[PDB]
Nucleic acid binder design. Structure first.
Ligand code: SF4
Ligand code: CA
Ligand code: CA
Length: 1118
DNA sequence: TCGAATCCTGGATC
DNA sequence: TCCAGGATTCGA
């Protein structure tokens, strides 16, 4: 043990050595200082007793650039529950058995929601243990746990213990829960003296943040063609980085042919990017220079793109090959999980954010796309085959490109990432890098821990999984879930305001609507505006206008008119449903508990009942067969799980793995006795939601909603003030206002993120508070509101798309759109009401809203007040200029989430179910799809619209038919060459065949087995015609031949084509033109020609066929 | 004997 | 985590 003690002392002094090297002095004598808290880590530290105790370090910074550490001791503790009344005796045993390890043992009561009648006000006692250091927590936990399990299964001193809680919350999270310390607050701290603990006080007085120094860097390398770079053979060729708006470029002068000299590269006036240049004799000097410059400038935040996965290891290895050990110089080291970390400097990252939080569509996560979308400029791109060629022949081009990764990533990080992470971190205890790396579901739980602590409620355990659970009829389940909602495109076609369409609508629906018109607007005034009608003079005039319009619609229900395109959606519908229904993760009970609760008496109104749908997939075998298989596995002993030990009885093996053995043996049996692979069943259930259970969760959600709207209000105010400051042009005031604007906007984005996270936690596996019921009841209710909405609209008009959060709709031009009301209250001189929204809002107010909410009046009397509430509230959008949907090639199948939309300006408002870039798709489709949508806006009637957009396809088709005769072949290659790359060794497949594989075998044949050796072969192929009839996995030809010497080409082509008599080899002879013309067909048929036949227009492109089902349906309908 | 279903592989650094 | 594309497997 002493060897571990001295090892952890060694690492402690090593960290303090680094901190002194990076200027983080300690506090050493009594005094007070004010500082901003940037980071914290746990550490073991000595005290006056020379014992070793667990502690936490806090790192503070000051406006003057000074920095300091402080450290605080704190003792872990965890709770245990004895059998009734045994507390003293068991505590006497614990104190006897673990004297010298237990720091203290104590009795305390707690609130515990599962306790019978607990709402009457009962409580239970728990013992609290505590220890001098986190190791003894482990040692005691490991010894107590099995007695806990034994006593659980069976139901002496350990036999008395019954339950145990709260033994796995991280120690440094524990400390921030208990002592209310969060980072990016300002603090004042008093060191009273080494005899005494420090004391820390919040200073919310100070709002303005300091500026940390930030460093961003990237490296570029040699590598062999068609391969990933090799840490053992390749050499770093240059490294480039930004510090706080300044750029430096270090060149490995051995390779780069010329002495680079300084230059400037600005993407835009907002991005200056001046750059300074250094030349170093060789890679060892470049790495020395960089390790010197970092240790000089002492950066505090490092930032990099994907840097954990590629960029760090390549530096670490080459430094080690020169003996310049990374970890001693900078400090960065690989953690247990595989992330590079350091004690004094935080490794921020982008791609974790681009994934988790940035709302960007899949496959557009490439840096260059993110630069286009959020930064809005054209980065430069160059084919990684050429790197060495430029280095030999044209260095300035390689510099010019290679700086443009740094100048992009630094500004992206500063502008978008930095105020988001340091906003979100203000409300969570975890460290910044945990908050970035950790999955968002865990943040919701950590946040809920704070409230559960302040409410004095003891945590539940993590949810235990069951093995091979059974239905009552003994079907072993394989899957179980709530019935999810659905997405469906109802119709396909092209819709635009300019193009009249035919409508049919039921007149009786209008004779219902016109009865309620005043009531409708009254509601919009009374509930939504909170401006009583008595504050308006002309309320009657617009009501009679509306009634005249409704009458004019009623007179002629079937008509042709221009369309109005509206989008209807509900903001944050699921939180609103939670707030409305008082759903909580512990509100459910079985009726067996209301049998106990004294509040169960005649005419009580605490029971709310609601319904949800459940789905299961399970095997047909029943209780006998499963129990017989279990007895089979008991009667015959297993082999050892692997042949490194003796045979095992069933009690001597991993139970969870035995669950897989049982599953496999059932799957092997079933086909003898039964004749179905899966049975899938759906069912509907209802559950009593206790309406006056403790409320802290809903109170949290409501608080977050209200704070969200507060910060939106302040952001609007500060944006106006910023416009005023920028008009004035006073640089200090401009700075102050812009700082406030960023701080408020980041805070509102952070709360938006948390709010959206509050739903996604409840379904998570293993999480502390969990119930699929609450996940189901919300989701099923989220369908009724949408279905009843269409149950209205489909009588008025036509819905085009139905989606999880809203619908897309089209209404006759004659419909009442919006109005303004002449207020008397000059506080708000005019109000505008959108009638199509207000007409919907009252429906959901009437049907859905809760009228049996309850709230506590008095803790000593438990008098309760009944109430009603609602917050479900539709929002309207647009109206939009145009919308387009595709159609499926196959009959009888429905698209999802795939369409385009255009705003009244004519610019794209949306384009979804597609993307403008992919690494796995050939160029021709990408160009074609882009050009067709931009053409669809042209023309003025449907026959003109299709007559115009046909002109792109009838271009490309003749490009192919004319063999691209006039096109340069370099363009031809770029137009038709696929792309792929292999992430595995060829040995790891054994045998299988696909086009992605065959090219690698052929490249090996061409270059030798050098290509085989490892993962990361990059390959480019085209599909040949000549070997007729074989599957397409055969005919793939790698491009690299066509660069090679003629006779070598002839020799290998005659082989792979199986033609000893071909006498031409120019690519035009070889290409299987028919394949490409077909696959372009398989795109055009999904956009232009099927929809037109589905929208009463004759085929606009005769050179491509319809499928036979449509051809017959056309003939039979004609 | 043909059609429907199943499973496989990649994207994200260079 | 999600979809396209291709081939094999399974059923009438
Ligand atoms: S709903 Fe009423 S009777 Fe049922 S457990 Fe809750 S408080 Fe008791
Ligand atoms: Ca790069
Ligand atoms: Ca990189």
């Amino acid at each position: 043990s002493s060897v571990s003690a001295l090892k952890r002392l060694e690492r402690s002094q090593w960290t303090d050595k680094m901190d002194l090297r990076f200027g983080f002095e300690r506090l050493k004598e009594p005094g007070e200082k004010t500082g901003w808290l940037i980071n914290m880590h746990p550490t073991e530290i000595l005290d006056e007793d020379k014992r070793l105790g667990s502690a936490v370090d806090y790192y503070f910074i000051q406006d003057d650039g000074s920095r300091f550490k402080v450290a605080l001791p704190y003792k872990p503790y965890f709770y245990i529950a004895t059998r009734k009344g045994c507390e003293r005796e068991v505590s006497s045993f614990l104190s006897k058995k673990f004297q010298g390890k237990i720091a203290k043992v104590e009795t305390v009561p707690k609130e515990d929601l599962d306790l019978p009648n607990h709402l009457v006000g009962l409580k239970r006692n728990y013992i609290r243990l505590s220890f001098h250091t986190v190791e003894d927590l482990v040692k005691v936990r490991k010894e107590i746990s099995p007695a806990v399990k034994k006593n659980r299964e069976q139901d002496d001193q350990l036999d008395n213990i019954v339950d145990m809680r709260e033994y796995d919350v991280p120690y440094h999270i524990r400390l921030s829960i208990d002592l209310k310390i969060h980072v990016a607050h300002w603090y004042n701290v008093r060191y009273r003296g080494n005899a005494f603990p420090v004391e820390i006080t919040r200073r919310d007085d100070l709002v303005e943040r300091p500026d940390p120094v930030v460093l961003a860097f990237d490296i570029e390398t040699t590598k062999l063609p068609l391969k990933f770079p090799d840490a053992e053979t390749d050499q770093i060729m240059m490294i480039s980085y930004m510090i706080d708006g300044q750029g430096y470029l270090i060149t490995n002068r051995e390779i780069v042919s010329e002495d680079i000299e300084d230059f400037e590269f600005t993407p835009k006036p907002e991005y200056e990017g001046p750059f300074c240049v250094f030349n170093e004799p060789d890679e060892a000097h470049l790495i020395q220079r960089w390790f010197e410059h970092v240790q000089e400038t002492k950066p505090t935040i490092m930032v990099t793109y994907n840097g954990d996965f590629f960029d760090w290891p390549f530096v670490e290895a080459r430094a080690a090959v020169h003996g310049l050990s990374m970890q001693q110089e900078i400090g960065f080291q690989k953690d247990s999980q595989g992330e590079y970390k350091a004690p004094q400097c935080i490794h921020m990252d982008c791609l974790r954010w681009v994934k988790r939080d940035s709302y960007l569509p899949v496959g557009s996560h490439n840096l260059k796309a993110a630069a286009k979308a959020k930064l809005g400029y054209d980065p430069v791109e160059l084919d990684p085959e050429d790197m060495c060629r430029m280095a030999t022949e044209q260095p300035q081009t390689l510099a010019t490109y290679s700086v443009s990764d740094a100048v992009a990533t630094y500004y992206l990080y500063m502008k978008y990432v930095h105020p988001f992470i340091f906003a979100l971190c203000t409300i969570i205890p975890m460290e910044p890098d945990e908050v970035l790396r950790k999955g968002s579901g865990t943040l919701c739980e950590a946040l809920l821990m704070v409230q559960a602590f302040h409410a004095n409620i003891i945590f539940p355990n993590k949810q235990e999984q069951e093995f091979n659970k059974l239905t009552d009829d003994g079907h072993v389940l394989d899957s179980e879930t709530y019935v999810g909602g659905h997405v469906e495109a109802l119709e396909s076609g092209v819709f635009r305001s300019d193009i009249p369409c035919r409508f049919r609508m039921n007149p009786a629906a209008f004779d219902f609507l016109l009865q309620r018109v005043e009531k409708t607007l009254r509601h919009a005034l009374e509930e939504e505006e909170k401006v009583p009608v008595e504050q308006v003079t002309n309320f009657e005039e617009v009501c009679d206008e509306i009634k005249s319009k409704l009458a004019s619609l009623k007179d002629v229900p079937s008509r042709i008119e221009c369309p109005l395109i509206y989008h209807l959606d509900v903001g944050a519908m699921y939180p609103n449903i939670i707030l409305t229904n008082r759903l909580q993760p512990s509100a459910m009970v079985d009726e067996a508990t209301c049998a106990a609760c004294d509040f169960n008496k005649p005419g009580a109104n605490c029971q709310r009942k609601m319904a949800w749908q459940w789905r299961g997939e399970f095997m047909p075998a029943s209780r006998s067969e499963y129990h017989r298989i279990q007895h089979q596995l008991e009667s015959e002993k297993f082999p050892p799980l692997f042949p490194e030990g003796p045979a095992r009885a069933f009690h001597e093996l991993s139970r969870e793995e035995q669950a897989k053995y049982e599953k496999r043996r059932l799957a092997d049996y079933c086909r003898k006795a039964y004749k179905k692979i899966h049975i899938t069943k759906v069912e509907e259930r209802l559950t009593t939601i206790c309406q006056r259970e403790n409320s802290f969760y809903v109170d949290t959600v409501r608080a977050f909603r209200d704070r969200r709207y507060e910060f939106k209000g302040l952001h609007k105010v500060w944006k106006k003030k910023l416009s005023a400051a920028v008009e004035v042009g006073d640089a200090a005031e401009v700075k102050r206002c812009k700082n406030m604007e960023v701080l408020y906007d980041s805070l509102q984005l952070a709360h938006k993120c948390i709010l959206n996270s509050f739903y996604g936690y409840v379904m998570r596996k293993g999480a502390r508070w969990y119930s699929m019921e609450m996940a189901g009841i919300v989701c099923f209710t989220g369908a009724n509101i949408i279905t009843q909405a269409r149950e209205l609209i489909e009588q008025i008009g036509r819905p085009l798309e139905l989606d999880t959060d809203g619908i897309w709709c089209v209404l006759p031009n004659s419909f009442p759109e919006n109005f303004v009301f002449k207020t008397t209250n000059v506080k708000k001189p005019k109000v505008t009401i959108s009638y199509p929204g207000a007409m919907l809002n009252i429906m959901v107010k009437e049907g859905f809203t809760n009228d049996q909410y309850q709230e506590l009046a008095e803790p000593s009397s438990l008098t309760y007040v009944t109430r009603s509430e609602n917050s479900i509230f539709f929002e309207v959008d647009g109206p939009y200029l145009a919308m387009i949907l595709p159609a499926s090639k196959e009959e009888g199948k429905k698209l999802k989430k795939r369409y385009a939309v255009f705003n009244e300006d004519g610019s794209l408002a949306e384009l979804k179910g597609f993307e403008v870039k992919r690494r796995g798709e050939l160029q021709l489709i990408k160009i074609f799809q882009s050009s067709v949508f931009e053409a669809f806006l042209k023309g003025s009637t449907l026959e003109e619209v299709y007559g115009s957009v046909a002109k792109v396809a009838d271009y490309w088709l003749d490009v192919l038919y004319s063999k691209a005769a006039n096109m340069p072949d370099s363009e031809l290659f770029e137009l038709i060459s696929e792309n792929r790359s292999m992430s595995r060794k060829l040995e790891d497949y054994g045998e299988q065949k696909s086009t992605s594989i065959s090219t690698a075998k052929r490249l090996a044949e061409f270059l030798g087995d050098q290509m085989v050796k490892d993962a990361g072969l990059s390959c480019r192929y085209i599909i040949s015609r000549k070997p007729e009839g074989s599957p397409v996995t055969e005919r793939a030809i790698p491009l690299a031949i066509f660069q090679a010497e003629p006779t070598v080409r002839k020799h290998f082509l005659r082989k792979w084509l199986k033609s000893s008599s071909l006498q031409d080899f120019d690519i035009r002879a070889i290409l299987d033109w028919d394949y490409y013309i077909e696959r372009l067909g398989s795109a055009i048929q999904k956009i232009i020609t099927i929809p037109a036949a589905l929208q009463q227009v004759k085929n606009p492109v005769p050179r491509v066929k319809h499928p036979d089902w449509l051809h017959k349906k056309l003939l039979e309908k004609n």
